[PDB]
Amino acid sequence: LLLDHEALSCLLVLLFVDEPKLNTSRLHRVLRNLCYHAQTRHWVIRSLLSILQRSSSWLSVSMDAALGCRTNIFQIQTVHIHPQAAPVVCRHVLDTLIQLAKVDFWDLLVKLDNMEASPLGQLMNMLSHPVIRRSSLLTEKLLRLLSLISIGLTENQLQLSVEVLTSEEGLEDAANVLLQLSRGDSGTRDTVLKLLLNGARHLGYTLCKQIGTLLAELREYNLEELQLPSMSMLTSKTSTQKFFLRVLQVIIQLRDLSLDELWDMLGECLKELEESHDQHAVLVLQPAVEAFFLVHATEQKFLRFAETHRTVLNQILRQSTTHLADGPFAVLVDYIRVLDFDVKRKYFRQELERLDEGLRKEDMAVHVRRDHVFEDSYRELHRKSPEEMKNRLYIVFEGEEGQDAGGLLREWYMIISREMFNPMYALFRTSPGDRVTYTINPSSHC
Amino acid sequence: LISIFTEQELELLISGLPTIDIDDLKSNTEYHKYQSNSIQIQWFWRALRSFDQADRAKFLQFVTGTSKVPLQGFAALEGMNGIQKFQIHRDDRSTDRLPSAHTCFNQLDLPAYESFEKLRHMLLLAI
C-alpha cells in the first residue's frame, strides 16, 4: 500500500477540475503505476465508476459550463455533481479508464472538504444514462473502452442501440465489441445476432416506408433536378440506409432477414428513378443496393437485379470511389457484361496495380539507333524479365539532344508500332479484305 | 485480367476510343433501301448521337470491321473493292432479328424496326 485512500482521493479530485494546462497524461500514468497494486487498482476503479454513476471550502470548483452559468462541480448537502460539469467529469474519467483498461471515495472526499471483466457490466449499463447517451464523444470513448476490455441481454440491447441509433470509429469499436463478445459464448453470439436481426428488420421496415414515400413523390413529380424532400432523410449521413448497411456488415462479420417488400420496392424505385431521366438521383439508394448485394451474393437473384439495373449499377460504381475489386460489388468480376468499358478499364488498372503492388518500379534506359530502334530494343529486352519491362523505359538515341521524355516516348512507341508492319520483319500483313488491318504474316518463317 | 474486355474493348484499350465525326460519316453514308429522310434513319442518327463514344466506336467496328477512323475522313473509307462508303440497307427479313453486317462492303442490313426505342435497343444489343 504505497498510498492511502485519502491521497488517492486527493489525486482523483484532479479529474473533476477542468484545467487545460494540467498534464492529465502524466496523471494517468501516475494512477496506472499506482494501480499495479491490486487493492489500489480495485479501489481506484470502484471510485471512478462511482464518479460516472454520480455524474449521471476546498471543494469549491467553479466550471464555466454555459452562458451566464458558472456551476459548482460539487453540490454537498450525498455529494452530487452538477449536470453542467458532468460531461467533463465523464470525459476525464473515460480518458483515465481507457488507460487502466490498456493496463468510499465520496466519504473520504467529504472528510477532506470539512477540513477488468466484471465491471464491464457497469460500463455497458452506462450507455443508458443520459449525459453519455447524448454525447457522441463520451459514447465513442466508452465504446473504445468496451472494445479494449472485451479482449447481459439488456446490456447487449444497449450496445446495439448504439448502432441502430447514432461516429464511424466509435461504431467500428462497437463492432469490435460485438465481435469479441461473440468470440466469448455461443449464447451471447446467438442473442446478439438475433437482436441485430431484430433491429435490422425494424430499420428495413422504416426504410421501406421512406422509399415508398420517395417513389410515390417521384410518381407525382413525373405525372405532371431532383430535390425531392423525401430524399433529405436518405442523403443524411445518419440515414437508416447507413444504419442498415452498418448492421448487416456486422452480421456478415459474425456469420464467420426476409424483406422482399423492401427488395422489390427498392427495385421499382430504382426503375422509376432511371425512367425519370436523372442519373446521380440513383445514388441516394446506393447503400441500400450495397446492403442488397451484401445479404445476397453471399461470399442468381443478384444477377437478375444487376441485369435489370445494369446501367444503373454502372452509374453507381462509376460514381463510387469504392475500389471495384475491394468493395462489395466485386462478385460480378466474372459476369463482365454487367460493367461499362471504362469501369472495366479502371478495374483492370487497379487490379493490375494490386497484383503488381509489391514491385518497386525504377527508371530504365533503352539505348537505340534511330535507324535500328526495333532490333536494338529486341536485343536489349527480349531476354529481359517481365519485371524489367515493368520499369519505366526511357529511350536514348545516339548523339541526339535532350528533349521532353514524354514526347520522346510517344515518338518511340509510334516508330515501333510502325516498324512492326515493315514487311522486312515479316510480323504482320494486311487483311486482303479490309486492306487496312493487320494479322500475323504466315510468311514469317523467313 | 485482360479477359474482362471484349474483343471490341481490347481494340479500344490498345488504340483508344476514336472521335467520330458523325458529320463526316453522314456526309459519306450511302442509303440503299432506306432514304436519308426515312424515319428509321432519323432514329438511327438520333440513336448514334445518343450513344457514347464507346458505343459509336463499337458501331464503327460493327459496320467497317474496325474502330480505326480514316485520317482523311470517311470519304476515304476503304472496303474490299476500293473506297467503300458506310452504307445502310433495309433488311426486308423479319424485324425480330438483329441488323447484320458485311464489313468488306461496309454493309449494314437493318430491319425496319417499328420505333426509335426498339431500334436503339436492338442496335445497342448488337454492338
Sort out which chain A residues have CB atoms less than 8 A from B78's CB and list them. 434-436
Set B10, B76, B104, B118: catalytic member: B104
CA B36 vs CA A326, A420, B87: distances in Å: 49, 41, 11
CA A148 – CA A139 distance, rounded (Å): 14
Q: Who contacts B68 (Cβ-Cβ below 8 Å, separation ≥6)?
A: A436, A437, B15, B18
Sort out which chain A residues have CB atoms less than 8 A from B13's CB and list them. 345, 348
Cβ <8 Å between B13 and A345: yes
Resolution to one decimal, Å: 3.4
Cβ <8 Å between A352 and B80: no
Exposed e or buried b per residue across A106-125, where buried means at least 16 C-beta atoms within 10 angstroms of its C-beta: bebbbeeeeeeeebbeebbb
Residue A362's identity, in one-letter code, is: E
Q: How far is B4 from chain A (nearest CA, A)?
A: 6
Cβ contact A156:A181 at 8 Å: yes
Q: How many CA atoms lie within 13 A of B54 on its CB side?
A: 16
Backbone angles phi, psi at B108, to 5 degrees: -105, 125
Sort out which chain A residues have CB atoms less than 8 A from B65's CB and list them. 433-434, 437
- Which of B13, B54, B104 lies at the smallest CB-CB distance from A433? B104
Sort out which chain A residues have CB atoms less than 8 A from B77's CB and list them. none
Other C-beta atoms within 10 Å of A151: how many? Answer: 11
CA A395 – CA A409 distance, rounded (Å): 7
Q: Is the torsion defined by CA of A364, A368, A374, A375 positive or negative? A: negative
Other C-beta atoms within 10 Å of A360: how many? Answer: 7
Cβ <8 Å between B5 and A345: yes
Q: Is the torsion defined by CA of A228, A234, A235, A236 positive or negative? A: positive
Considering only CA atoms, give the Rg of chain A: 33
> A149, A53, A142, A57: which is closest to A105 by C-alpha?
A53
CA A84 vs CA A20, A21, A74: distances in Å: 18, 21, 11
Cβ <8 Å between A434 and B12: no
Element (H, E) at A364: strand A363-368
Q: How many CA atoms lie within 13 A of A83 on its CB side?
A: 6
**Whether B105 is catalytic:** no
Q: Is the torsion defined by CA of A163, A165, A168, A174 positive or negative? A: negative
Q: Residues A13, A19, A20, CA angle at the centre, nearest 5°?
A: 140
Cβ <8 Å between B13 and A352: no
Q: Residues B79, B84, B90, CA angle at the centre, nearest 5°?
A: 105
Backbone angles phi, psi at A45, to 5 degrees: -65, -40
Q: Indicate the SS3 state at residue B60.
A: helix
CA A391 – CA A407 distance, rounded (Å): 18
